[PDB]
Amino acid sequence: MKKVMFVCKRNSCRSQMAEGFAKTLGAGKIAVTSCGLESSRVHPTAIAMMEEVGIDISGQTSDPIENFNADDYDVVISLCGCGVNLPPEWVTQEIFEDWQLEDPDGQSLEVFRTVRGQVKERVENLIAKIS
């Protein structure tokens, strides 16, 4: 299928969640992956907020951007604040976006819920373009 990527920074739960919604909502329409995990591990509070909607982001893990090749992912979604000097292969894709969204860092459950919800709409919009 069309290959997709979600690049992560800060508490990477927001951007790996974008992949978690994208595997869920893009199922059988796209192939989807994530990279960067700047929180050095996943964050159980995000897993709980995704369990609250029947999604899993604990099985996800760290793998650096420099080992990826956007030339091999037709649609790439940075979440680095639309201000990172991605190699030019990250631009030639069918989609190149940067969902410069909120930061759940070590926040309340409400931000872990809210950022997830706002991400899910961006995910579903991306899906609406491709799937």
From Swiss-Prot:
Q: Does the keyword Oxidoreductase apply?
A: yes
Fill in the misc note: Cys-8 probably provides the initial functional group for covalent attachment of the electron-accepting substrate, arsenate, to ArsC.
One GO-annotated biological process of the protein: response to arsenic-containing substance
What's the gene? arsC
User: Changing residue 13 to S does what?
Assistant: Little or no effect on arsenate reductase activity. Abolishes protein phosphatase activity
Q: Which residues form the active site?
A: 8 (nucleophile), 80 (nucleophile)
Q: What happens after mutating residue 35 to A?
A: Little or no effect on arsenate reductase activity
The name this protein carries in UniProt is Glutaredoxin arsenate reductase
State the organism named in the record.
Synechocystis sp. (strain ATCC 27184 / PCC 6803 / Kazusa)
Documented EC number(s): 1.20.4.1, 3.1.3.48
**Known outcome of mutating residue 8 to S:** Abolishes arsenate reductase activity
For this protein, the record's Pfam families field holds: LMWPc
Oligomeric and partner information: Homodimer.
Name the catalysed reactions: O-phospho-L-tyrosyl-[protein] + H2O = L-tyrosyl-[protein] + phosphate; [glutaredoxin]-dithiol + arsenate + glutathione + H(+) = glutathionyl-S-S-[glutaredoxin] + arsenite + H2O
Is Protein biosynthesis one of the keywords UniProt gives this record?
Answer: no
Database matches in SUPFAM superfamilies = Phosphotyrosine protein phosphatases I
Q: Which GO terms describe its molecular function?
A: arsenate reductase (glutaredoxin) activity; protein tyrosine phosphatase activity
Q: Which Gene3D superfamilies match?
A: 3.40.50.2300
